[PDB]
Amino acid sequence: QPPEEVDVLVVGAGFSGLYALYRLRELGRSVHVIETAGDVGGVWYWNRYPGARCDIESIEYCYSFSEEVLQEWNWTERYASQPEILRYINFVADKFDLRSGITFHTTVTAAAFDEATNTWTVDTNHGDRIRARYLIMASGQLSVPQLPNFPGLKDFAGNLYHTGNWPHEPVDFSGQRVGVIGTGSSGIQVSPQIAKQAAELFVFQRTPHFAVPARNAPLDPEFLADLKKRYAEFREESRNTPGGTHRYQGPKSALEVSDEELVETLERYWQEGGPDILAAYRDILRDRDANERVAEFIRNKIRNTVRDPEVAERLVPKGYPFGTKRLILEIDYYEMFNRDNVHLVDTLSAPIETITPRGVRTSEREYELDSLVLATGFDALTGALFKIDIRGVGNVALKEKWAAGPRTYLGLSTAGFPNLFFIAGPGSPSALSNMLVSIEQHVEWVTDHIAYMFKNGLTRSEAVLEKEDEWVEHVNEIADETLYPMTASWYTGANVPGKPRVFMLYVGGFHRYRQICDEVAAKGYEGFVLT
Ligand SMILES: Cc1cc2nc3c(=O)[nH]c(=O)nc-3n(C[C@H](O)[C@H](O)[C@H](O)COP(=O)(O)OP(=O)(O)OC[C@H]3O[C@@H](n4cnc5c(N)ncnc54)[C@H](O)[C@@H]3O)c2cc1C
Ligand SMILES: NC(=O)c1ccc[n+]([C@@H]2O[C@H](COP(=O)([O-])OP(=O)(O)OC[C@H]3O[C@@H](n4cnc5c(N)ncnc54)[C@H](OP(=O)(O)O)[C@@H]3O)[C@@H](O)[C@H]2O)c1
């Protein structure tokens, strides 16, 4: 049961909300959180599909705000499984008694600024009404599942699942004819797991995404002990990087090197595994010819992975630059296609027409299935905010202001909507980074800002409209220096039909972006109106 007035409300109980709750307490503030879900964890609470695993390594993908948590906690594998990560979150939440500051089972529905009192009044599906000086939107980047644009979906007789709203109690596909739609990270992760239990597996792929080997391994518990001795320092280094990790920044250009050098250099990445390949060369995301050279190498690796060249060629990604859809880490995925019971249905030759109660109809045949798994992604970046009637000055709706794409200052706030902050979302580095580094800066930067308003006894913080536009024009200016906006991905909005095709994410580098937020805060929050 939620308090009637509060200094700051936080929506979302994943990494972001939890940390905001922790830190606002530290700074002597009344703070409370509302979360749709039954318990903490966010993505790692929702995404229980089998195979679910982080793609940034354990030693990197973690909170660094607590010397205690760094020293105590023991990660076991190169990449944490979803259960491992959920325990981690449960551990941190227990350590600081965080639930006491959280309402669960509660979806927020509407929020509305009030010029009279400079406060947000905020409503829920339980009928709660809450009044606050600030509202922190920590409701995520990949949180509202999206479903494919297909008729007959409610007719399917068998069992229907989305990977981001997966059952809490494990599913049995034993001896079933199972189908998966979507071959993004989710579809690539969950598929080899089902391949192992199902009688026959049908993988319905549209556009092939580029995937490289994870090469998971046990963590050497002595390497973890040396590291722990300099943990704070290790992390501080990851903060001083474009991507938030120790990924080496290749100084050279993909074009300047010989064919022989390109192969040997990319081969040492392919053997090691992980996503560091993205930065093998300075200009992979800057030059069509550079990219193409890297893209081809990866393409051949794929062809050598599958025995049936016909089926191999169907997996090769075509028509978009390498890296401009999110890069996926695979484990035994392409190898899966060698098994008698695994079938790759290519929806580009043969588009899906409809879901029948027996299964899936493409243009060429019909497929019969006991279960259909939807690994079709999310209403990315804007989706969770959009489900919420957010109204600010002049009764202006958030949804409409942003219909031509997100409009923000530093991604952190928007003109016409004072006292409102978005954690790790459009206009900022957000997902183009180890999201934990993205999430800490933002929680800190916002929370420092709230602390600053109270000490100086102010009550109203708004983005100057000119700066907001200056910023937005800046984000698209740099986006267009790269290869990013030239491909239909969730970054653009291209998976939600009708959504405006614009690249939603800052591309300058976490490092660069964070020194801008620092100068800003340093000059007393330049580009804001404070009263
Ligand atoms: C399957 C998956 C795996 C991931 N893998 C990686 C990875 O490899 N590396 C990486 O850096 N990042 C990864 N990400 C990105 C991920 O978003 C971040 O890593 C991070 O977990 C985000 O945490 P968060 O607190 O910002 O939001 P989330 O974890 O997304 O939490 C948002 C919460 O807000 C709640 N919520 C939303 N709207 C409302 C509202 N109306 N009312 C009440 N509650 C609401 C949701 O239920 C959810 O619990 C992954 C994402 C997914 C989907
Ligand atoms: N290992 C990890 O670290 C991990 C795991 C899961 C998620 N994530 C994060 O969250 C993002 C989501 O990954 P995701 O796989 O869940 O979602 P996604 O990347 O958006 O994948 C969408 C997939 O579903 C397909 N699809 C969507 N609509 C379709 C339709 N109407 N008909 C047929 N196919 C359709 C897409 O094909 P098209 O390409 O042709 O659109 C693609 O194959 C990831 O990129 C990453 O940022 C990370």
UniProtKB/Swiss-Prot annotation:
UniProt superkingdom: Bacteria
Enzyme Commission designation: 1.14.13.92
UniProt entry tagged with the keyword Cell membrane: no
Catalytic reaction list: phenylacetone + NADPH + O2 + H(+) = benzyl acetate + NADP(+) + H2O
InterPro entries: FAD-binding_Monooxygenases (IPR050775), FAD/NAD-bd_sf (IPR036188), Flavin_mOase-like (IPR020946)
Binding site for NADP(+): 53-55, 183-189, 206-207, 325-326, 490
Activity over temperature: Thermostable. Displays an activity half-life of 1 day at 52 degrees Celsius.
UniProt subunit comment: Monomer.
Function as written in the Swiss-Prot or TrEMBL entry: Catalyzes a Baeyer-Villiger oxidation reaction, i.e. the insertion of an oxygen atom into a carbon-carbon bond adjacent to a carbonyl, which converts ketones to esters. Is most efficient with phenylacetone as substrate, leading to the formation of benzyl acetate. Can also oxidize other aromatic ketones (benzylacetone, alpha-methylphenylacetone and 4-hydroxyacetophenone), some aliphatic ketones (dodecan-2-one and bicyclohept-2-en-6-one) and sulfides (e.g. methyl 4-tolylsulfide).
Family: Belongs to the FAD-binding monooxygenase family.
Name of protein: Phenylacetone monooxygenase
Source organism of the structure: Thermobifida fusca (strain YX)
Top-level taxonomy: Bacteria, Bacillati, Actinomycetota, Actinomycetes, Streptosporangiales
Gene name of the record: pamO
